[PDB]
Assembly symmetry: D2
Homo-oligomer: 123 residues x 4
């Protein structure tokens, strides 16, 4: 549901995610990371299943943040792939891939993988 | 390198995606796959880092495709994270995560991972 | 440290992991999964850093379980890659890859990725 | 297919691993890489599913290498998960996770992921 995803979310690292889910399946907002070579807010863009299922299945979504803004440029991009689960305590459980640009030679070590869980605070 | 991300790319599977790279880091376009519960074009939105470094590194980027369009809804979304490299043969090398919406009970098996290499050939 | 890893561990799904860390960096034991097309115990083999660092850095390790025993055969294998962190509450935090054998055609969907956290109960 | 996993394999990077596949699912051998804080041979231990299905599927397997030997200790371990396929050109297609031991503080960036294809060429 767009509404349910829309809001302010935080994860276990202390990062802030502000997103708006649009009617057409779009996600736009800004990400504030608590870690990494990242300072201030970064623009995020993603997509979600505007028409999930009835049942108590999560809503699949994903989004990308390139870590370049007017203050910094880490030359990397992270994509989070997960599911939104609503209820009294809504969560977005994700797995992410962080790719740094590298020379052909170090391309084998350009991507990190992890997982983040977000808890909603505001709409 | 710059601009050159813009165009039509194809992968091993036969998938095709057309993207437009905007001066400030946005990626917009459509994705048409060859495998899965997919049928036609899907909208894709991503970001790419517009000021890559000047050591011969690739340009980091990523995009998402929710697999829902006016014809099908596979209740899943794929995110590709990778880097673009130009030259006589430009390619985008990526790793992807495909998450399907599941009930709590099947959450452990909701995400597939793979890799795709796209070229303009 | 071999000792610290040796023991009985459980994760959030309810699976049992019984492992012995040998002096030479080896890990052997059995895995009892609570989910999947898996019944009874399965043999596991892995390796760990017998000489970690001083500091409060985790000990990197990894192990594999092919899901075939005398009772079942899911034709898949899972490898867990993570770190052991000791202390009063020792944990093994991992990320895993589950690959199912497939035809060339469905190879794109042969691997699942997730993460498990194990808590120690016994040696 | 069976037995055929046993042998010497090489990957794109130039890494080489020699493995022995035992009748009951064990994989044993040595791994020598071409990249990273690695120097010489490392011991590898894995498992492979000894009764693959009879639809033309690959044989699922996986192995681990802790990057410590008598010469170096990179305080990391790599696990490769994939499947073997035989034929005139047998190959092992894998995806790997490389975890480095870190302090809690850097736990978020402890694991790299990639893919390797090994052939006997
Ligand atoms: N809030 C989170 N931040 C880290 C993880 C996923 S992306 C990462 C921050 C990286 C910042 C930029 C960088 O270091 O390249 N979750
Ligand atoms: N070009 C690719 N197609 C498959 C992989 C990653 S995304 C995937 C197609 C999935 C279609 C929808 C589905 O089956 O859920 N790469
Ligand atoms: N204890 C765990 N079991 C599931 C995850 C990782 S492997 C998986 C069980 C799979 C069983 C065999 C199968 O279904 O193929 N953790
Ligand atoms: N053949 C491969 N070599 C690199 C990738 C995955 S494992 C890795 C070598 C790592 C060496 C030790 C290290 O740098 O930590 N594939």
């Amino acid at each position: 549901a767009e509404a349910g995803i829309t809001g302010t979310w935080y994860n276990q690292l202390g990062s802030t995610f502000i997103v708006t889910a649009g009617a057409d399946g779009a996600l736009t907002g800004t990400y504030e990371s608590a870690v990494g070579n990242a300072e201030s807010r970064y623009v995020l863009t993603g997509r979600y299943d505007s028409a999930p299922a009835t049942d108590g299945s999560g809503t699949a979504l994903g989004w990308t943040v390139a870590w370049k803004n007017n203050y910094r440029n880490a030359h990397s991009a992270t994509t989070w792939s997960g599911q939104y689960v609503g209820g009294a305590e809504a969560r977005i459980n994700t797995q992410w891939l962080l790719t740094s640009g590298t020379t052909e030679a170090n391309a084998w070590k350009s991507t990190l993988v992890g997982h983040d869980t977000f808890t909603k605070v505001k709409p």
